[PDB]
């Protein structure tokens, strides 16, 4: 699939996406490097997406691919996306950042929607804490300085907007903003710390765990 | 690769086959140039999103 997902023909690329649903829905443990390889193919499936109508249907399709993944490696799937997007973000050109901005917006909402889905089966705070832990050793990791801040400003901008969309009526009490607070409290890059609060739209109404 | 800024350096200031040197202005004989002038904005080679 990996070579086919980055083909020079959209028809070839699309047929690998439809075949990827069966591959991801497997009930077996996927190693982390296996998802690293897959997301490099999926990155170039969207890197080569041509029209804005298509490249926004594709982002919906890729985000809609998260619930297909097995529950045990669903967190690995998303954590590998945010790691494959951090390292490749700087090499994107100015005319391709706006299709990947929408891709991260669709994957941020997929994370919140997956928390919503799992909040019915198990208590919400465990689900959020598990997802928050994913953010900790991912984009919001303080130990690595290689992660771009252009993505983190994006996540701050869209964090509450996607949260409101996932729960139109009212969101419960949880540590929705934990990755941001722990980052501004301990980030080693002052530009991130000084301007992340200015961009995050954190509301105190629902943050008390 | 399409660096789109490395391209303009190579064409905009080194050699383009489409360039007419003028006393007051350079031109393009490129068919896709909107203005017919050689400059960074109207270069069809150097602008990957062009109309």
């Amino acid at each position: 699939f990996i070579k086919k997902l980055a083909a020079n023909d959209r028809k070839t690329r699309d047929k690998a996406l439809e075949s990827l649903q069966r591959f991801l829905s497997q009930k077996k443990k996927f190693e982390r490097l296996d998802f690293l390889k897959l997301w490099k193919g999926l990155f170039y499936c969207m890197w080569m997406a041509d029209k804005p109508l298509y490249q926004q249907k594709l982002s919906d399709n890729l985000a809609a691919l998260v619930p297909i993944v097995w529950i045990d490696n669903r967190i690995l799937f998303q954590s590998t996306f945010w790691e494959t997007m951090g390292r490749e973000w700087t090499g994107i050109d100015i005319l391709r950042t706006d299709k990947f901005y929408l891709l991260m917006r669709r994957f941020c909402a997929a994370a919140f929607r997956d928390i919503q889905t799992r909040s019915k089966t198990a208590l919400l705070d465990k689900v959020v804490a598990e997802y928050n832990q994913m953010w900790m050793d991912g984009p919001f990791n303080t130990e690595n300085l290689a992660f771009p801040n252009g993505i983190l400003f994006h996540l701050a901008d869209i964090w509450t907007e996607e949260l409101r969309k996932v729960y139109p009526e009212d969101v419960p009490k949880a540590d929705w903003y934990l990755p941001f607070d722990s980052t501004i409290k301990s980030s080693h890059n002052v530009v991130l710390r000084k301007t992340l609060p200015k961009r995050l739209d954190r509301v105190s109404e629902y943050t008390k765990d | 690769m399409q660096q789109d800024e490395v391209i303009w350096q190579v064409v905009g200031h080194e050699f383009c086959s489409y360039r007419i040197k003028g006393e007051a202005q350079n031109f393009c004989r490129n068919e896709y140039n909107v203005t017919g002038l050689c400059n960074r904005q109207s270069c069809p080679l150097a602008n990957s999103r062009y109309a």
Binding site: K3, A6, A7, N8, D9, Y44, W47, M48, E88, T90, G91, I92, D93 | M1, Q3, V6, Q9, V10, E14
Partner: protein
């Protein structure tokens, strides 16, 4: 830094085949018109006959 990962291959009849070749790293080498011009200026002299 990101670039097209693979390259298509054609047959005699000009039809695209299914095999693709991963783009070699030489196509990601820096494109240096000033360097190429200087090295060309010298390499272009090395078949000159004396007069």
């Amino acid at each position: 830094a990101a670039a097209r990962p693979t390259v298509s291959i054609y047959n005699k009849d000009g039809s695209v085949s299914s095999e693709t070749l991963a783009l070699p790293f030489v196509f990601k080498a820096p494109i240096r018109p000033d360097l190429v011009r200087s090295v060309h200026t010298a390499v272009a002299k090395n078949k000159r006959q004396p007069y």
